[PDB]
Ligand binder design. Structure first.
Ligand code: SF4
Ligand code: SF4
Ligand code: NA
Length: 284
């Protein structure tokens, strides 16, 4: 499984990004871009986009693919996080913002209010900035606000796009994800369309975890059945030796081919390639 050529070059490239790095730390908030040293930073920062991580910076779930730092207990909730993010968005002059969060099984609203508050803070401070949500599944809802109502709170704030990743095919949901299921994640996407069919929905998979093309294609059809508009396909790269190994490096050609299959199946926006991530070119 050594690193293929098409990946060594872009994974070793560095760009001028220091102002952004400094501001994020200074304002006391966290981005996926920085928490994972994303190889797309030069391009995204250049396009005035970033992905902020709410309710962390650690997660307790420890999904075997995920780059978020593992935490011993739920991160204390910062009531000023929404305002601080909006201030960063303003000073960075971002045009397109993706909001995501860690899973918060411990909170009565599963953290859904934090999304709503952050969206409100950004709208009141930053004119023209669009906001995409990369949502948790909100599935652990016994005695909580229901999965449906968590989604509804966010849908009510009219994101530019509602993204919820399946991450992998049905067969691999067990080993790849913790606390998630295939049907629950598809239900997130369907629920958004029930609540407001005008909100674009998006999902994504990471390839290289042992899925086959046959299984990928079935998953694409499953996504179109719940009216998923947008798709990202990217290469799984283990964040550390403790994470799942890469089974396969999918070639640029294979990503192109699958990209085109997805377009034929009616996805209206598709990004497919080795360094593609959920937020990559999200602004379109
Ligand atoms: S791909 Fe996503 S995570 Fe990476 S730099 Fe762009 S916005 Fe940040
Ligand atoms: S995928 Fe979500 S739940 Fe799993 S570790 Fe990452 S942040 Fe936590
Ligand atoms: Na992302």
């Amino acid at each position: 499984r050594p690193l293929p050529s098409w990946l060594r070059k872009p994974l070793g490239k560095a760009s001028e990004i220091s102002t952004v790095q400094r501001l994020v730390r200074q304002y006391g908030i966290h981005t996926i871009c920085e928490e994972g040293r994303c190889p797309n930073r030069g391009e995204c920062y250049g396009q005035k986009t970033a992905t902020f991580l709410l309710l962390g910076p650690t997660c307790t779930r420890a999904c075997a693919f995920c780059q978020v730092e593992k935490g011993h207990a739920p991160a204390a909730v910062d009531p000023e996080e929404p305002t601080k993010i909006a201030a960063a968005v303003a000073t960075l002059g971002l045009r397109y913002v993706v909001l995501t969060s860690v899973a918060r099984d411990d909170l009565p609203d599963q953290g859904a209010g934090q999304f709503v508050a952050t969206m409100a803070a950004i709208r009141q401070r930053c004119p023209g900035t669009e906001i995409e949500v990369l949502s948790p599944d909100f599935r652990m809802d016994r005695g909580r606000l229901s999965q449906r109502d968590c989604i509804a709170q966010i849908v009510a704030a009219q994101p530019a796009c509602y993204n919820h990743n399946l991450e992998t095919v049905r067969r691999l949901q067990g080993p790849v994800r913790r606390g998630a299921t295939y049907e629950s994640s598809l239900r997130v996407l369907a629920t958004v369309k029930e609540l407001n069919p005008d909100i674009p929905t998006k999902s994504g998979l990471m390839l290289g975890l042992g899925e086959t093309e046959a299984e990928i294609i079935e998953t694409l059809k499953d996504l179109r059945r719940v009216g998923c508009d947008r798709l990202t396909l990217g290469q799984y790269l283990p964040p550390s030796l403790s994470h799942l190994p890469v089974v396969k490096y999918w070639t640029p050609e294979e990503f192109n081919t699958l990209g085109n299959i997805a377009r034929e199946l009616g996805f209206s926006h598709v990004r497919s390639g080795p360094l593609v991530r959920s937020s990559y070119h999200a602004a379109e």
